[PDB]
Short mmCIF file of C-alpha atoms and ligand atoms in Angstrom, two decimals:
data_model
loop_
_atom_site.label_atom_id
_atom_site.label_comp_id
_atom_site.label_asym_id
_atom_site.label_seq_id
_atom_site.Cartn_x
_atom_site.Cartn_y
_atom_site.Cartn_z
CA UNK A 1 -55.42 -6.24 20.21
CA UNK A 2 -58.98 -7.50 20.61
CA UNK A 3 -59.56 -9.75 23.56
CA UNK A 4 -60.69 -12.58 21.34
CA UNK A 5 -60.67 -13.66 17.66
CA UNK A 6 -62.20 -16.62 15.82
CA UNK A 7 -61.85 -16.30 12.06
CA UNK A 8 -64.31 -19.16 11.64
CA UNK A 9 -67.23 -17.05 12.83
CA UNK A 10 -66.63 -14.77 9.90
CA UNK A 11 -66.65 -18.01 7.92
CA UNK A 12 -63.01 -17.67 6.76
CA UNK A 13 -61.93 -21.21 7.57
CA UNK A 14 -62.77 -24.30 5.52
CA UNK A 15 -64.15 -27.59 6.85
CA UNK A 16 -61.76 -29.68 8.96
CA UNK A 17 -59.97 -32.19 6.74
CA UNK A 18 -58.26 -35.63 7.11
CA UNK A 19 -54.65 -36.19 6.30
CA UNK A 20 -54.87 -39.95 6.44
CA UNK A 21 -52.01 -42.15 7.57
CA UNK A 22 -49.77 -39.69 5.83
CA UNK A 23 -47.41 -37.02 7.25
CA UNK A 24 -48.79 -34.43 4.92
CA UNK A 25 -49.83 -32.04 7.79
CA UNK A 26 -47.38 -29.42 6.49
CA UNK A 27 -49.47 -29.41 3.35
CA UNK A 28 -52.79 -29.18 5.28
CA UNK A 29 -51.40 -26.37 7.36
CA UNK A 30 -50.14 -24.45 4.45
CA UNK A 31 -53.16 -24.97 2.18
CA UNK A 32 -55.46 -24.03 5.11
CA UNK A 33 -53.56 -20.77 5.50
CA UNK A 34 -54.03 -20.20 1.74
CA UNK A 35 -57.73 -20.97 1.75
CA UNK A 36 -58.05 -18.38 4.47
CA UNK A 37 -55.78 -15.72 2.91
CA UNK A 38 -57.64 -16.03 -0.28
CA UNK A 39 -61.09 -15.85 1.24
CA UNK A 40 -60.31 -12.67 3.19
CA UNK A 41 -58.90 -11.20 -0.01
CA UNK A 42 -62.42 -10.68 -1.19
CA UNK A 43 -62.77 -13.98 -2.95
CA UNK A 44 -65.11 -16.80 -2.23
CA UNK A 45 -64.34 -19.64 0.13
CA UNK A 46 -62.69 -22.26 -2.07
CA UNK A 47 -61.28 -25.62 -1.03
CA UNK A 48 -57.74 -25.92 -2.20
CA UNK A 49 -55.53 -28.90 -2.77
CA UNK A 50 -52.91 -30.38 -0.48
CA UNK A 51 -52.34 -33.09 -3.04
CA UNK A 52 -50.68 -30.53 -5.28
CA UNK A 53 -48.12 -29.94 -2.57
CA UNK A 54 -47.69 -33.56 -1.54
CA UNK A 55 -47.19 -34.89 -5.03
CA UNK A 56 -45.46 -31.92 -6.79
CA UNK A 57 -43.53 -29.95 -4.19
CA UNK A 58 -40.12 -31.66 -4.41
CA UNK A 59 -38.65 -29.15 -2.04
CA UNK A 60 -40.40 -31.03 0.67
CA UNK A 61 -40.97 -34.72 1.37
CA UNK A 62 -44.59 -35.64 0.71
CA UNK A 63 -46.03 -38.19 3.08
CA UNK A 64 -42.76 -38.16 4.95
CA UNK A 65 -43.24 -34.55 5.99
CA UNK A 66 -42.10 -31.04 5.28
CA UNK A 67 -42.14 -27.29 5.99
CA UNK A 68 -44.81 -24.73 5.34
CA UNK A 69 -42.37 -21.99 4.43
CA UNK A 70 -41.04 -24.22 1.71
CA UNK A 71 -44.57 -24.98 0.57
CA UNK A 72 -45.33 -21.32 0.13
CA UNK A 73 -41.98 -20.69 -1.45
CA UNK A 74 -42.53 -23.48 -4.01
CA UNK A 75 -46.05 -22.41 -4.84
CA UNK A 76 -44.89 -18.98 -5.69
CA UNK A 77 -41.64 -19.89 -7.49
CA UNK A 78 -42.22 -23.11 -9.40
CA UNK A 79 -46.03 -22.74 -9.65
CA UNK A 80 -46.05 -19.01 -10.44
CA UNK A 81 -48.27 -18.34 -7.38
CA UNK A 82 -51.02 -20.66 -8.59
CA UNK A 83 -52.80 -23.00 -6.23
CA UNK A 84 -55.31 -25.50 -7.66
CA UNK A 85 -58.79 -26.19 -6.50
CA UNK A 86 -59.10 -29.32 -4.37
CA UNK A 87 -61.96 -30.62 -6.56
CA UNK A 88 -59.63 -30.79 -9.57
CA UNK A 89 -56.53 -32.07 -7.74
CA UNK A 90 -58.14 -34.16 -5.00
CA UNK A 91 -56.32 -35.88 -2.10
CA UNK A 92 -55.30 -39.42 -2.87
CA UNK A 93 -52.72 -39.96 -0.18
CA UNK A 94 -54.81 -41.38 2.70
CA UNK A 95 -52.58 -44.41 2.85
CA UNK A 96 -49.09 -43.00 3.36
CA UNK A 97 -48.48 -43.33 -0.35
CA UNK A 98 -48.55 -40.17 -2.44
CA UNK A 99 -49.45 -40.30 -6.16
CA UNK A 100 -46.83 -38.91 -8.53
CA UNK A 101 -47.23 -35.40 -10.08
CA UNK A 102 -49.86 -34.67 -12.74
CA UNK A 103 -50.06 -31.40 -14.68
CA UNK A 104 -53.32 -31.73 -16.58
CA UNK A 105 -56.88 -32.03 -15.28
CA UNK A 106 -56.87 -29.31 -12.71
CA UNK A 107 -58.21 -25.76 -12.10
CA UNK A 108 -56.50 -22.79 -10.40
CA UNK A 109 -58.34 -21.84 -7.28
CA UNK A 110 -56.11 -19.09 -5.80
CA UNK A 111 -53.01 -16.84 -6.15
CA UNK A 112 -50.33 -15.91 -3.72
CA UNK A 113 -47.26 -13.85 -4.42
CA UNK A 114 -45.26 -14.67 -1.37
CA UNK A 115 -45.48 -15.33 2.34
CA UNK A 116 -44.42 -13.72 5.60
CA UNK A 117 -42.47 -15.17 8.49
CA UNK A 118 -43.70 -14.06 11.95
CA UNK A 119 -41.79 -12.91 15.01
CA UNK A 120 -41.23 -15.66 17.61
CA UNK A 121 -43.57 -13.72 19.78
CA UNK A 122 -47.01 -14.94 20.80
CA UNK A 123 -48.48 -11.49 21.20
CA UNK A 124 -47.39 -10.19 17.82
CA UNK A 125 -48.53 -13.39 16.22
CA UNK A 126 -51.86 -12.76 17.89
CA UNK A 127 -52.17 -9.10 16.88
CA UNK A 128 -51.14 -9.91 13.35
CA UNK A 129 -53.70 -12.77 13.33
CA UNK A 130 -56.38 -10.28 14.33
CA UNK A 131 -55.46 -7.97 11.52
CA UNK A 132 -54.66 -10.49 8.67
CA UNK A 133 -56.14 -13.76 9.71
CA UNK A 134 -55.27 -17.49 10.16
CA UNK A 135 -51.58 -18.47 10.50
CA UNK A 136 -49.76 -21.63 9.64
CA UNK A 137 -47.84 -22.86 12.63
CA UNK A 138 -45.39 -25.64 13.40
CA UNK A 139 -45.84 -27.36 16.77
CA UNK A 140 -44.87 -30.11 19.13
CA UNK A 141 -47.92 -32.41 19.02
CA UNK A 142 -46.47 -35.08 21.25
CA UNK A 143 -48.94 -34.76 24.09
CA UNK A 144 -51.74 -34.33 21.51
CA UNK A 145 -52.92 -37.87 20.74
CA UNK A 146 -54.46 -37.97 24.20
CA UNK A 147 -56.40 -34.65 23.79
CA UNK A 148 -60.14 -34.96 24.07
CA UNK A 149 -61.07 -31.35 24.92
CA UNK A 150 -60.44 -28.22 26.89
CA UNK A 151 -57.48 -25.87 27.21
CA UNK A 152 -54.55 -28.22 27.26
CA UNK A 153 -52.01 -26.56 29.55
CA UNK A 154 -49.33 -29.19 30.02
CA UNK A 155 -47.88 -29.50 26.56
CA UNK A 156 -44.74 -31.40 25.87
CA UNK A 157 -42.70 -28.71 24.11
CA UNK A 158 -39.29 -29.87 22.79
CA UNK A 159 -39.34 -30.74 19.13
CA UNK A 160 -41.56 -29.46 16.37
CA UNK A 161 -43.38 -32.34 14.71
CA UNK A 162 -46.68 -31.09 13.34
CA UNK A 163 -48.16 -28.46 11.00
CA UNK A 164 -51.55 -26.87 11.94
CA UNK A 165 -53.45 -23.66 11.67
CA UNK A 166 -54.05 -20.89 14.14
CA UNK A 167 -57.57 -19.59 13.43
CA UNK A 168 -57.89 -17.52 16.53
CA UNK A 169 -57.46 -16.98 20.27
CA UNK A 170 -59.00 -15.73 23.45
CA UNK A 171 -57.31 -13.50 26.14
CA UNK A 172 -60.32 -12.82 28.37
CA UNK A 173 -60.54 -16.44 29.41
CA UNK A 174 -59.30 -17.85 32.75
CA UNK A 175 -56.51 -19.66 30.86
CA UNK A 176 -55.82 -17.58 27.79
CA UNK A 177 -55.73 -19.84 24.69
CA UNK A 178 -55.03 -20.27 21.02
CA UNK A 179 -57.56 -21.83 18.70
CA UNK A 180 -56.21 -24.44 16.45
CA UNK A 181 -57.37 -26.22 13.32
CA UNK A 182 -56.07 -29.82 13.10
CA UNK A 183 -56.03 -31.98 9.99
CA UNK A 184 -56.99 -35.06 11.90
CA UNK A 185 -60.74 -35.53 11.48
CA UNK A 186 -63.50 -33.61 13.22
CA UNK A 187 -63.80 -36.82 15.25
CA UNK A 188 -60.57 -35.69 16.94
CA UNK A 189 -60.22 -32.99 19.65
CA UNK A 190 -62.84 -30.30 19.87
CA UNK A 191 -64.62 -31.20 16.63
CA UNK A 192 -61.34 -31.25 14.77
CA UNK A 193 -59.96 -28.35 16.82
CA UNK A 194 -57.71 -27.93 19.86
CA UNK A 195 -57.25 -25.13 22.27
CA UNK A 196 -53.93 -24.84 24.08
CA UNK A 197 -52.69 -22.16 26.49
CA UNK A 198 -51.64 -18.78 25.14
CA UNK A 199 -48.78 -17.05 26.87
CA UNK A 200 -46.16 -19.65 27.68
CA UNK A 201 -45.05 -20.85 24.21
CA UNK A 202 -47.05 -24.08 24.72
CA UNK A 203 -45.99 -26.65 22.19
CA UNK A 204 -43.38 -24.21 20.78
CA UNK A 205 -46.19 -22.48 18.86
CA UNK A 206 -44.38 -19.14 18.71
CA UNK A 207 -41.51 -20.84 16.86
CA UNK A 208 -42.15 -21.36 13.13
CA UNK A 209 -45.20 -19.19 12.30
CA UNK A 210 -45.94 -17.97 8.81
CA UNK A 211 -48.60 -17.13 6.37
CA UNK A 212 -49.08 -16.98 2.57
CA UNK A 213 -49.72 -13.49 1.30
CA UNK A 214 -52.57 -13.06 -1.15
CA UNK A 215 -51.66 -9.68 -2.69
C1 2VC B 1 -35.44 -32.69 7.30
N1 2VC B 1 -36.69 -32.61 8.02
C2 2VC B 1 -37.44 -33.81 8.32
C3 2VC B 1 -38.84 -33.78 7.77
N2 2VC B 1 -39.53 -32.62 8.17
C4 2VC B 1 -40.76 -32.70 8.89
O1 2VC B 1 -41.20 -33.78 9.13
N3 2VC B 1 -41.52 -31.49 9.33
C5 2VC B 1 -42.79 -31.60 10.07
C6 2VC B 1 -43.48 -30.23 10.13
C7 2VC B 1 -43.15 -29.33 11.32
C8 2VC B 1 -42.50 -28.01 10.90
O2 2VC B 1 -41.33 -27.62 11.64
N4 2VC B 1 -40.55 -28.52 12.29
C9 2VC B 1 -39.15 -28.19 12.55
N5 2VC B 1 -38.70 -26.97 12.20
N6 2VC B 1 -38.31 -29.08 13.23
C10 2VC B 1 -43.78 -32.69 9.56
O3 2VC B 1 -44.06 -32.79 8.32
N7 2VC B 1 -44.47 -33.56 10.43
C11 2VC B 1 -45.27 -34.62 9.75
C12 2VC B 1 -46.60 -35.37 10.05
C13 2VC B 1 -46.87 -35.95 11.21
S1 2VC B 1 -48.62 -36.07 11.69
O4 2VC B 1 -48.81 -35.76 13.08
O5 2VC B 1 -49.42 -34.99 11.04
C14 2VC B 1 -49.30 -37.65 11.34
N8 2VC B 1 -48.56 -38.57 10.62
C15 2VC B 1 -49.04 -39.82 10.28
C16 2VC B 1 -50.27 -40.18 10.84
C17 2VC B 1 -51.03 -39.26 11.58
N9 2VC B 1 -50.57 -38.01 11.85
C18 2VC B 1 -44.36 -35.84 10.08
C19 2VC B 1 -44.19 -36.78 8.95
C20 2VC B 1 -43.99 -38.23 9.34
C21 2VC B 1 -43.39 -38.58 10.53
C22 2VC B 1 -43.25 -39.91 10.88
C23 2VC B 1 -43.76 -40.94 10.05
C24 2VC B 1 -44.41 -40.58 8.89
C25 2VC B 1 -44.52 -39.22 8.50
C26 2VC B 1 -38.89 -31.39 7.79
C27 2VC B 1 -37.44 -31.35 8.14
#
């Protein structure tokens, strides 16, 4: 595998969002993966809607939280693969309250037909990520609210609590690292991102990794 990857530099990744006081990070993770799998599929960079997931995906629990695998599953099964634009199903859950489901007013912004579930193996996750792009990942973010910058190397890693996006890594570095999109504003972390150490299952990042498949 290449010694370093950052899918952002190829412009594959959308602007860093804001989930609000709402445990909708599973939605932000998933949607971010979709935005990226849809870009790389030859299509233009389009902002997609987490609100669709939060309000409509009943297989998960809205502002109370959820899984990404279920998000993907639901999109493909109940929503026939269709994911709406963000502009036409905008986020209205910045206050821990999620609007009910609406079925008119929107516009389809992407298609996925399934998703894949990655080996609990950091290196394969990495290789794959080099070949196919950004990966939704579940993580322990317990030590994260105190992260200002750098390669965090002392992660509490015991229970998975968060949903974020792997956009790349680096292996040449002194401390090898992952490169991670967060849905807490760009005013958090490294302009909305965090790097953690690659190689030790920091934050249980090798655990639940998956990605929507566009085509
Ligand atoms: C049955 N059960 C319980 C609910 N659930 C779940 O919560 N999953 C996580 C995703 C991690 C994926 O894998 N995890 C594992 N396999 N164990 C989730 O949705 N976490 C959200 C946001 C937290 S946040 O950091 O983004 C945040 N919230 C509020 C303000 C700022 N930041 C947690 C949701 C939540 C937690 C406490 C209070 C409110 C909301 C799936 C399985």
